[PDB]
Amino acid sequence: AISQERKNEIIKEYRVHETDTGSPEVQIAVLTAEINAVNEHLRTHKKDHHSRRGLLKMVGRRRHLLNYLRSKDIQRYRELIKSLGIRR
Amino acid sequence: MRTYEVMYIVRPNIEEDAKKALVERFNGILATEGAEVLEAKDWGKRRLAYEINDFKDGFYNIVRVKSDNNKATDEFQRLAKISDDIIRYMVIRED
Amino acid sequence: GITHIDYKDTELLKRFISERGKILPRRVTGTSAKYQRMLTTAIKRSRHMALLPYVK
Amino acid sequence: NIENGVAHIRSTFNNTIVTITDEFGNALSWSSAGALGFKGSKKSTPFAAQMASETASKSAMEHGLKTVEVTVKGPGPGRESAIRALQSAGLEVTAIRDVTPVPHNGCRPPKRRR
RNA sequence: AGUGCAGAAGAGGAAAGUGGAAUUCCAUGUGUAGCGGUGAAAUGCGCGAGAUAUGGAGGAACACCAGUGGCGAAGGCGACUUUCUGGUCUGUAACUGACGCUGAUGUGCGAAAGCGUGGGGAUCAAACAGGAUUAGAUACCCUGGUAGUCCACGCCGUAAACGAUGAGUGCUAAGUGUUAGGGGGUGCCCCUUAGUGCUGCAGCUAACGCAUUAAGCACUCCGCCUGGGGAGUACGACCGCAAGGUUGAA
């Protein structure tokens, strides 16, 4: 898996000092970057069907978080659908 | 956090020096890319369940070496099936 | 109860072992399920090398 | 027929192959249920295998085997009549191995009559 | 609440086969009268197969830690030398101060076979070659026998998806089997912030069953249903490599 070093080093970075980890930014940040790494075992050994559940489960988490933050500010969704690598 | 306690079985009908050749390689195959080589004991020169080319057993040891890159014991494992002198390759992870 | 036992050991798995080279069922034994699971597992890391027979 | 014998006897539910041999395969003597007239569900039966080993031991006439250290393989009910009655000259069923057909569920099975 | 999380489980999944049920093949260490066959026998390997295994690597599965255990939404599921991988979250929640529920747009994808590489036999199983039958057999029976039985690539979907259980809000005794893992803790007593299967209070439904861990009572959507056939037969509209679907008055 992403060795817990990977989790904790990436997770401290993708949220500004709004005084802790766990924003609508960095939560999905770790989630999707982990997607992107695990997509290789969904591509290299592209016989992987069941982390196609841990994947799309947190995709649905990411999606219900993503589909409504236009009203938090202009800059969260504007700059952050730029500041996340994921579609739309 | 992934110990490659690379233990193995050597040939049976041979001498001590053949044991030593094998055991210094199988301590050494890992040094390259992270050694942490602790001790080297020489376990049972014993048999097993059934026959292995008219014989049934071989020589043993104890090899404490770890590699977090996971590619030093692959060497120990891929270059084993082929040659009937390295008859088994079973390592652990002391995780 | 015991501490760990791993594929260093193959006859500390003789307490719960048969005469053919296998182990007795856990239901007939009945101890620390977790500790006995890994302890018995290592003997199967040893049926790899097969120091204990299958039949004579 | 070298002054000793080793019993590699067999009994599939049919053709109880009573076979007292020597250590290698040097073909001492053999027997059968198809050696003493029985077919009609007296093939592997205790009342039809009373004298199943003397088509071997006294069609030897020079050995009179003296031991087994047997490997009672190919088991049935004909086993018992092929061991206890293997003591009609001194053939001395002595040791056993507890190794009968015990394959390991890798085979594929033949069919089932209802 | 979600990422922090000890991480931690279980056959959640991807791990070559070093070794082993190593198979019906056979000179064989060994040989010939049997490996073997049965409601009823021929089937069937012997004019130089045999019995089990001395070389026995291999077509391959972990055979034994294997339990009803438990990852996950149903189809599942077994050593690992382990190549990787998420969530799940079990304790409270650090951050933000609603951080929204059934979800016809889309996408869709889901059992051997039906499906895609040539491998295609370890050779069993279809057809059955074949015996045989009480008055009554190409047959569940019987050795052997051509798809398949040994698959890393195109897409799927009919099954008793018999799971015939659709998902928001709690719930009127809790114990109880207990789960890796735990709120107080420390082979000694445990409670759900929890999980399952429940004997079953209590009360409803419809004769029945659920039950502190609810078809009962209260806010829910895609909806179907509202006596039977025949009826999916005129005919039919649109997906589509294929089984085919998926429609539709009389």
mmCIF file with all atom_site columns, C-alpha atoms in Angstrom, chain D residues 53-112:
data_model
loop_
_atom_site.group_PDB
_atom_site.id
_atom_site.type_symbol
_atom_site.label_atom_id
_atom_site.label_alt_id
_atom_site.label_comp_id
_atom_site.label_asym_id
_atom_site.label_entity_id
_atom_site.label_seq_id
_atom_site.pdbx_PDB_ins_code
_atom_site.Cartn_x
_atom_site.Cartn_y
_atom_site.Cartn_z
_atom_site.occupancy
_atom_site.B_iso_or_equiv
_atom_site.pdbx_formal_charge
_atom_site.auth_seq_id
_atom_site.auth_comp_id
_atom_site.auth_asym_id
_atom_site.auth_atom_id
_atom_site.pdbx_PDB_model_num
ATOM 1  C CA . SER D 1 53  ? -3.503  -67.148 1.403   1.00 0.00 ? 53  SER D CA 1
ATOM 2  C CA . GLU D 1 54  ? -2.796  -70.868 0.868   1.00 0.00 ? 54  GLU D CA 1
ATOM 3  C CA . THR D 1 55  ? -3.113  -70.453 -2.882  1.00 0.00 ? 55  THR D CA 1
ATOM 4  C CA . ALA D 1 56  ? 0.159   -68.618 -2.125  1.00 0.00 ? 56  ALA D CA 1
ATOM 5  C CA . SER D 1 57  ? 1.980   -70.187 0.838   1.00 0.00 ? 57  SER D CA 1
ATOM 6  C CA . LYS D 1 58  ? 1.619   -73.859 -0.206  1.00 0.00 ? 58  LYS D CA 1
ATOM 7  C CA . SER D 1 59  ? 1.891   -73.007 -3.849  1.00 0.00 ? 59  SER D CA 1
ATOM 8  C CA . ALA D 1 60  ? 5.375   -72.011 -2.703  1.00 0.00 ? 60  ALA D CA 1
ATOM 9  C CA . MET D 1 61  ? 6.591   -75.386 -1.363  1.00 0.00 ? 61  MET D CA 1
ATOM 10 C CA . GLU D 1 62  ? 10.141  -74.051 -0.993  1.00 0.00 ? 62  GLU D CA 1
ATOM 11 C CA . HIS D 1 63  ? 9.792   -70.743 0.925   1.00 0.00 ? 63  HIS D CA 1
ATOM 12 C CA . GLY D 1 64  ? 7.103   -70.879 3.567   1.00 0.00 ? 64  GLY D CA 1
ATOM 13 C CA . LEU D 1 65  ? 7.461   -67.130 4.152   1.00 0.00 ? 65  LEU D CA 1
ATOM 14 C CA . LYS D 1 66  ? 8.427   -65.945 7.609   1.00 0.00 ? 66  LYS D CA 1
ATOM 15 C CA . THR D 1 67  ? 7.497   -62.262 8.186   1.00 0.00 ? 67  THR D CA 1
ATOM 16 C CA . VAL D 1 68  ? 5.698   -59.347 6.558   1.00 0.00 ? 68  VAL D CA 1
ATOM 17 C CA . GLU D 1 69  ? 6.724   -55.919 7.724   1.00 0.00 ? 69  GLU D CA 1
ATOM 18 C CA . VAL D 1 70  ? 3.578   -55.456 5.693   1.00 0.00 ? 70  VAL D CA 1
ATOM 19 C CA . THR D 1 71  ? 2.268   -52.494 3.733   1.00 0.00 ? 71  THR D CA 1
ATOM 20 C CA . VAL D 1 72  ? -1.451  -53.265 3.857   1.00 0.00 ? 72  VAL D CA 1
ATOM 21 C CA . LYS D 1 73  ? -2.314  -51.072 0.882   1.00 0.00 ? 73  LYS D CA 1
ATOM 22 C CA . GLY D 1 74  ? -5.449  -51.232 -1.215  1.00 0.00 ? 74  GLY D CA 1
ATOM 23 C CA . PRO D 1 75  ? -7.721  -51.834 1.748   1.00 0.00 ? 75  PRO D CA 1
ATOM 24 C CA . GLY D 1 76  ? -11.055 -53.584 1.975   1.00 0.00 ? 76  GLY D CA 1
ATOM 25 C CA . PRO D 1 77  ? -12.744 -56.233 4.110   1.00 0.00 ? 77  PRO D CA 1
ATOM 26 C CA . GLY D 1 78  ? -10.568 -58.878 2.409   1.00 0.00 ? 78  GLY D CA 1
ATOM 27 C CA . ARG D 1 79  ? -7.621  -57.348 4.272   1.00 0.00 ? 79  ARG D CA 1
ATOM 28 C CA . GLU D 1 80  ? -8.223  -59.265 7.489   1.00 0.00 ? 80  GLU D CA 1
ATOM 29 C CA . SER D 1 81  ? -8.623  -62.661 5.764   1.00 0.00 ? 81  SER D CA 1
ATOM 30 C CA . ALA D 1 82  ? -5.401  -61.756 3.904   1.00 0.00 ? 82  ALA D CA 1
ATOM 31 C CA . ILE D 1 83  ? -3.369  -61.161 7.086   1.00 0.00 ? 83  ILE D CA 1
ATOM 32 C CA . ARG D 1 84  ? -4.622  -63.439 9.882   1.00 0.00 ? 84  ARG D CA 1
ATOM 33 C CA . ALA D 1 85  ? -4.697  -66.318 7.363   1.00 0.00 ? 85  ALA D CA 1
ATOM 34 C CA . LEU D 1 86  ? -1.150  -65.337 6.350   1.00 0.00 ? 86  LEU D CA 1
ATOM 35 C CA . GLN D 1 87  ? 0.040   -67.412 9.317   1.00 0.00 ? 87  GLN D CA 1
ATOM 36 C CA . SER D 1 88  ? -0.484  -70.933 7.899   1.00 0.00 ? 88  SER D CA 1
ATOM 37 C CA . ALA D 1 89  ? 3.188   -71.959 7.775   1.00 0.00 ? 89  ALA D CA 1
ATOM 38 C CA . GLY D 1 90  ? 4.791   -69.384 10.060  1.00 0.00 ? 90  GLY D CA 1
ATOM 39 C CA . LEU D 1 91  ? 4.449   -66.450 7.646   1.00 0.00 ? 91  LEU D CA 1
ATOM 40 C CA . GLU D 1 92  ? 4.411   -64.213 10.670  1.00 0.00 ? 92  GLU D CA 1
ATOM 41 C CA . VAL D 1 93  ? 2.498   -61.034 9.944   1.00 0.00 ? 93  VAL D CA 1
ATOM 42 C CA . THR D 1 94  ? 4.804   -58.919 12.094  1.00 0.00 ? 94  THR D CA 1
ATOM 43 C CA . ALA D 1 95  ? 4.795   -55.181 11.315  1.00 0.00 ? 95  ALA D CA 1
ATOM 44 C CA . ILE D 1 96  ? 2.436   -52.722 9.633   1.00 0.00 ? 96  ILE D CA 1
ATOM 45 C CA . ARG D 1 97  ? 2.615   -49.363 7.906   1.00 0.00 ? 97  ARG D CA 1
ATOM 46 C CA . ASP D 1 98  ? -0.473  -47.163 8.258   1.00 0.00 ? 98  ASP D CA 1
ATOM 47 C CA . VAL D 1 99  ? -0.286  -46.121 4.616   1.00 0.00 ? 99  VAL D CA 1
ATOM 48 C CA . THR D 1 100 ? -3.288  -47.211 2.541   1.00 0.00 ? 100 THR D CA 1
ATOM 49 C CA . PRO D 1 101 ? -4.655  -45.323 -0.457  1.00 0.00 ? 101 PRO D CA 1
ATOM 50 C CA . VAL D 1 102 ? -4.878  -41.849 1.037   1.00 0.00 ? 102 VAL D CA 1
ATOM 51 C CA . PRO D 1 103 ? -4.676  -39.474 -1.965  1.00 0.00 ? 103 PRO D CA 1
ATOM 52 C CA . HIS D 1 104 ? -5.173  -35.815 -1.222  1.00 0.00 ? 104 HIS D CA 1
ATOM 53 C CA . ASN D 1 105 ? -8.355  -34.729 -3.037  1.00 0.00 ? 105 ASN D CA 1
ATOM 54 C CA . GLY D 1 106 ? -6.534  -33.957 -6.266  1.00 0.00 ? 106 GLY D CA 1
ATOM 55 C CA . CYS D 1 107 ? -8.029  -36.824 -8.205  1.00 0.00 ? 107 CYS D CA 1
ATOM 56 C CA . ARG D 1 108 ? -11.372 -36.896 -9.977  1.00 0.00 ? 108 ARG D CA 1
ATOM 57 C CA . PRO D 1 109 ? -13.952 -39.444 -8.843  1.00 0.00 ? 109 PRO D CA 1
ATOM 58 C CA . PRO D 1 110 ? -15.807 -42.180 -10.732 1.00 0.00 ? 110 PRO D CA 1
ATOM 59 C CA . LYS D 1 111 ? -19.554 -42.397 -10.636 1.00 0.00 ? 111 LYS D CA 1
ATOM 60 C CA . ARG D 1 112 ? -22.252 -43.091 -8.004  1.00 0.00 ? 112 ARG D CA 1
#
